[PDB]
Design a protein around this ligand. Structure first.
Ligand SMILES: [Mg+2]
Ligand SMILES: [Mg+2]
Ligand SMILES: [Mg+2]
Ligand SMILES: [Zn+2]
Lengths: 242, 146, 129, 126, 109
RNA sequence: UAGGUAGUUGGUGGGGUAACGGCCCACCAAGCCGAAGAUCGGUACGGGCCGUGAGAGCGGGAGCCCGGAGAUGGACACUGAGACACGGGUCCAGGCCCUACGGGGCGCAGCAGGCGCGAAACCUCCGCAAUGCGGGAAACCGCGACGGGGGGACCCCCAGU
């Protein structure tokens, strides 16, 4: 860590949301930079080989990768270091199956299987919002991917909303607002993977983030951070959450 | 005398200070923190050492006893010091000759000092010419280099 | 000088009852003293008590029954969490429920046996058994 | 060898023994004293990360400005009363508070020449 | 009335300099403390003291501790010795000034 | 081991930097730490953790992971997104080597192996099949990293005579 950037990774010091065996070998895969961050994503090899089992060694998993067999978000990926993350739709178009990446109830990542007519839309949270040259609006999303909207619809797209886009094309349909009454699914924290409706929003001065209070089906008020609640549908969710 | 000095709730500093102050009236602690054993120790924190014998001598025993205990003068190699070491066993001194290399351990007394009626000696011989002494005393092995 | 009117009372009580007396006078009378007498009574250690005014802070008359072994003050007044009582009950008392340990909880003065039922803590002031 | 790292003396007055060596990312460069001349010279530097820095070294024009936002490129004559250093106005060194004497009045410099490679000014009032 | 993100009331005058958070071009962001002034000898700087308790663990008792820091003192709220002040955190202003005074409470006594 | 500090503490205007800053400079002041231990000496890589004890505690921080620092000792620059670079470049000091005597070179705190010191520590072995990294459009190629054996009363578990 002296003269330049790190390049390897150890099994011991790996992210603890991965489902890997930490004492079997010495090295893990150092994930290439890409869409999501490193505490909420996993390389592409550990899905071809460890999770689904289509390969036994890496040398025969890197032969079916660069043949155009794996479709992460509608588009073909070939390198074994690509990060796959929350609310992605990995899809194997030959075998005929689909999946969605989601966090567990204790924090790890899974591959909850979904339909085919639902393997076509992806939810996206709004993280920031700014103005670019020509006086247009750029919406920055929860996995570092962008979109432009005119200066006449700057009233439908505040931050922490949710947008539903067709995956390989990115045409907006059905924005979901954030307010009291909407249906949220938690992403990180200590209330991981719990659903419900919103009851309250509370704000603090001088830098600290704001909190949200939620009520689930059987009836229990808990709370999380406001940017951990992912709005998926209003009054009834849109994603086949498990 | 009264009760005991700083038994207050907000008197932590003075209580810790009194303890640290009186811990120095000890001798096992002062001698372990100032490291006084080293700086005055001919063997330098080793369990054993090696030397080359200069002359063979005999010591007189304590008062309620009688007899002469045989010993040698060893000249260490890592330092250059000269110590006095004891040869344990019945007839051992007839196997030690001058210009020999010997190995040296402690003698195992109280506090690391000396033991029994040999009062000033604090080391004992274990090996002669890379051949254990215990064997030589009871047959069972022969001495190299003459 | 005088620094603790509660310790003086509890030592006076345990000194008097050890030689056979049947009445004592707790001279400087707080209302903390009265509050601790109240809970020494409900568990059956003393008889009945009354507050007599004398123009200067008042006195307390209490009748003894010869039913206590030892009473005293836990002085430095340590705090306790609502789940850490046994650590102190193993230090002051002689068996697993022998006697009471008086606690100055945020809802008054009470014995640790009623603090564990609400699940609260506070400062320990004294102990009787 | 102009090291711009930490200091070697605590706020209390005790000395500090350095524990490492000088990193190449902490160093400094020479002051580019801008002069007045009849032709302006400037160089280009490569900086940390591959960026650049235009570095003015002699000055010829002034880019004087006004209150209605009307600039004019006119040349300068000499410097008077640079408060930065006591002996700059004499040697004609233009730093940033300098009072430039253009050929249309006086002016006050409002840009850093050694960093931008231009001289800008506002038309100082009497 | 202007706020800066503290939900408190601004001073009753106007300043000059640009190192003032209320009237100038400084931004505050970080911790927010509270103490009493122990010197203002040099120009525009004070020294603020606050106290807390350290809990030893072997002896299970407490212990009194201090902390002296240095803060910029804008000319619109110039604080003397012996008064409560609220101070906030921002970028390095000098070798040893990294805080700024924002509001004064209990001037005299 | 009782006083220590004079770019030392602060202000005003600037230079320099990727960047804030007495980090440097020109002027104006007299501030700043300290018996609740400053300054100066001593010893020491910091932590997760490890030994011992009924617990309160006392003792240690070589091996595995995470941060820091170093490449015979001291100074200094070029190329690059990143270095003032262990198998890249200059100068001094201190060692050694080849030479047709004019000139050239080298520095294992990488893996085996050698000398010296010591009471004290192993083979000059086989492989890119596995985990990973660099290169390449890809099949692939390289790796004393990592993987396989050789030597040794290293620590644990299960048995024989
Ligand atoms: Mg300045
Ligand atoms: Mg050291
Ligand atoms: Mg050994
Ligand atoms: Zn102001």
């Amino acid at each position: 860590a002296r003269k330049g950037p790190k390049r390897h990774l150890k099994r011991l010091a790996a992210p603890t949301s991965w489902y890997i065996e930490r004492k079997a070998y010495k090295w893990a895969v150092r994930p290439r930079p890409g869409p999501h961050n490193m505490r909420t994503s996993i390389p592409l090899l550990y899905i071809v080989r460890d999770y689904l089992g289509y390969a036994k060694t890496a040398r025969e998993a890197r032969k079916i990768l660069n043949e155009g067999k794996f479709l992460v978000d509608g588009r073909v990926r070939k390198d074994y270091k690509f990060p796959v993350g929350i609310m992605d739709v990995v899809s194997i178009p030959e075998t005929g199956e689909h999946y969605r990446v989601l966090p567990n109830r204790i924090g790890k990542l899974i591959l909850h299987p979904i339909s085919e007519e639902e393997a076509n839309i992806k939810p996206l949270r709004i993280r920031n919002k700014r103005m670019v040259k020509g006086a247009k609006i750029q919406l920055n999303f929860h996995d570092g991917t962008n979109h432009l909207i005119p200066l006449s619809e700057k009233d439908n797209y505040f931050t922490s909303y949710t947008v539903l886009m067709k995956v390989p094309e990115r045409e907006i349909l059905e924005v979901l607002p954030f307010e009291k009454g909407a249906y949220v699914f938690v992403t990180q924290g200590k209330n991981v993977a719990r659903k419900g409706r919103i009851v309250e929003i509370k704000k603090f001065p001088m830098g600290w983030p704001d909190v949200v209070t939620i009520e689930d089906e059987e009836g229990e008020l808990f709370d999380t951070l406001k940017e951990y609640a992912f709005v998926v549908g209003r009054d009834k969710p849109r994603i086949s959450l498990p | 005398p009264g009760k005991k000095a700083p038994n207050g709730e907000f008197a932590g500093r003075k209580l810790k200070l009194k303890r640290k102050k009186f811990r120095w009236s000890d001798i096992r602690y002062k001698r372990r923190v100032l490291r006084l054993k080293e700086k005055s120790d001919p063997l330098e924190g080793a369990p054993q050492a090696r030397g080359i014998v200069l002359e063979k001598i005999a010591v007189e025993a304590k008062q309620p006893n009688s007899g002469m205990r045989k010993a040698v003068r060893v000249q260490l190699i890592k330092n250059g010091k000269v110590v006095t070491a004891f040869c344990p066993g019945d007839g051992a001194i007839k196997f030690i000759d001058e210009h020999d290399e010997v190995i040296i351990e402690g003698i195992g007394g109280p506090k690391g000092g000396s033991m029994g009626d040999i009062p000033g000696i604090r080391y004992k011989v274990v090996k002669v010419n890379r051949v254990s002494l215990k064997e030589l005393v009871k047959g069972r092995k022969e001495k190299p280099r003459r | 000088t005088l620094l603790d009117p509660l310790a003086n009372a509890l030592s006076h009580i345990t000194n008097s009852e050890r030689v056979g007396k049947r009445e004592v006078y707790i001279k400087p009378a707080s209302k903390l003293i009265g509050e601790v007498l109240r809970v020494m009574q409900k568990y059956g250690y003393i008889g009945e008590f009354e507050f007599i005014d004398d123009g200067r802070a008042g006195v307390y008359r209490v009748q003894l029954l010869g039913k206590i072994n030892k009473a005293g003050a836990i002085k430095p007044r340590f705090p306790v969490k609502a789940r850490d009582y046994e650590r102190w009950e193993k230090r002051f008392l002689p068996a697993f429920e022998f006697g009471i340990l008086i606690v100055s909880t945020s809802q008054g003065v009470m014995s640790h046996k009623e603090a564990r039922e609400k699940g609260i803590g506070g400062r320990l002031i004294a102990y009787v058994y | 060898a102009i090291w711009q790292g930490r200091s070697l003396r605590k706020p209390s007055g005790g000395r500090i023994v350095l524990a490492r060596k000088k990193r190449k990312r902490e160093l400094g460069r020479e002051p580019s004293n801008t002069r007045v001349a009849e032709q302006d010279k400037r160089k280009i530097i490569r900086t940390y990360g591959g960026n650049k820095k235009v570095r003015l070294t002699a000055a010829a024009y002034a880019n004087v400005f006004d209150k209605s936002g009307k600039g004019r490129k006119v040349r300068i004559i000499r410097v008077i009363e640079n408060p930065a250093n006591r002996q700059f106005a004499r040697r004609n060194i233009i730093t940033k508070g300098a009072i430039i004497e253009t050929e249309i009045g006086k002016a006050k410099v409002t840009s850093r020449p050694g960093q931008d490679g231009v001289v800008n000014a506002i038309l100082l009032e009497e | 009335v202007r706020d800066i993100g503290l939900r408190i009331q601004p001073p009753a005058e106007k300043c000059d300099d640009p190192k003032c958070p209320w009237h100038g071009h400084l931004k505050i962001h970080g911790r927010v403390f509270e103490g009493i002034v122990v010197s203002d000898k040099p120009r525009k700087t004070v020294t603020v003291e606050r106290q807390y308790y350290h809990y030893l663990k072997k002896y299970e008792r407490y212990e009194l501790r201090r902390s002296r820091i240095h803060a910029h003192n804008p000319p619109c709220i110039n604080a003397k010795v012996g008064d409560r002040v609220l101070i906030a955190e921002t970028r390095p202003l000098s070798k040893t000034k990294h805080f700024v005074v924002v509001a004064v409470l209990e001037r005299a006594e």
